[model samples]
Target: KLHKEPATLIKAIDGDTVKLMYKGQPMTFRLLLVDTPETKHPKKGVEKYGPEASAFTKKMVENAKKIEVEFDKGQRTDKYGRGLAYIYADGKMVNEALVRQGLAKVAYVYKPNNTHEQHLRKSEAQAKKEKLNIWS
Candidate 1:
């Protein structure tokens, strides 16, 4: 299920999910190796920095002409049925960008399913050091 495909971004559903047009079909993907603050939840409602995360992701995708999607080899889909993948636009990793900007955190790490774990960790650490967004 780990096919690397070129995708046109439909929209950023939030900080972690994006709707994409891939292979002549529409698919929504949950970003791998990173998780942003929740904009929605059953009980918690909107978490701190959630809106900023969403705004950042929206701007990032809107500026990109195209995104390259790389799915996880072992677990391609999550329980929500969203395709779990890494997204890249113009050679920039979206997953890394979210963390570097302090809008997201390195989360839900599963061995062999994680693609950019180390990089995410580094970005998160740096973000914390710089006191950006969530760390602020």
Candidate 2:
């Protein structure tokens, strides 16, 4: 079933991840085309504001009763079989919010699902101009 602007409760896993429940099935989703600094990566050392990013995500998404999932022209699943998608809440793109707030960076892992690539780029540029994350 296609979720066209579906409204559901969201549980944020991290700055770049979230879990959504649809029809009693829990769906895990990772925000595509972007990668925030590792908040709990076993290998890579944590970067600045990693914890804050996670917290911010949680605060923004946890218990959110309404959300929108935007899909791109690509395989429904990623190589690891995870559902790749972009999330929006209150008409604001969550993934773009990460970049706009300087919590994450643009990560173009694939070509097809890059519907928000330009937005991410522009957000990053604005963040850089303000030196939000890169300042310290």
Candidate 3:
């Protein structure tokens, strides 16, 4: 669900994860339905554009004051207990942006949001056509 109010970006952990200050509380988020290569995953190997994706995310949202978070049915924490959220920055969904820009893959492990599924699909198609990540 999209909150009526917007939050502020505190820091970016990686290409697909970020920390935000919302109502004075720190919230860490892993973008839903998309996965970037492991830049920090200890056991997992790094994927292509993993660093680029992190840099891109930092460029887009680092130090930006305010953003929004839209929640889905599953608010329960992930295995690592990090909050899973759909991050929107500057009026654009950051997860979708990553896919659209050919920096990530659609990783809809949980239920569908149906909010940006179509757009994400289109983004994936364009990324494939452009051979941005895997194709590269």
Residue 28 CA error for candidate 2 (Å)? 0.9
Candidate number with greatest lDDT: 1
RMSD (Å) of each candidate, 1 decimal: 1.9, 2.6, 2.1
Tell me the spans in candidate 1 whose CA falls farther than 4 Å from its real position. Answer: 1-3
Query: Which is better, 2 or 3, measured by lDDT?
Result: 3
**Model 1 agreement with the true structure over 1-136: per-residue lDDT tens digits:** 4556799988788878899988888888998988788777558868898888888888888898767988876787889888888888877888899999999989978978875688789989999999998888
Better of 1 and 2 by TM-score: 1
CA lDDT for candidate 1: 0.84
- Candidate 3: which stretches are off by over 4 Å? 1-4, 63-65, 112-114
lDDT of 3 at 16: 83
lDDT of 3 at 39: 81
**What's the candidate order when arranged by decreasing lDDT?**
1, 3, 2
Output the lDDT of residue 130, model 3: 90
Residue 119 in candidate 3, Cα distance off native in Å: 2.4
Global Cα lDDT for candidate 3 = 0.77
**Compared with the true structure, what per-residue lDDT tens digits does model 2 show for residues 1-136?**
3345464655677677788875566787788788887677768656678888888777777645578777777776666555688887767778888888888888956776776689789998898788886434
Task: Flag clash pairs in model 3.
Answer: 1-71, 33-107
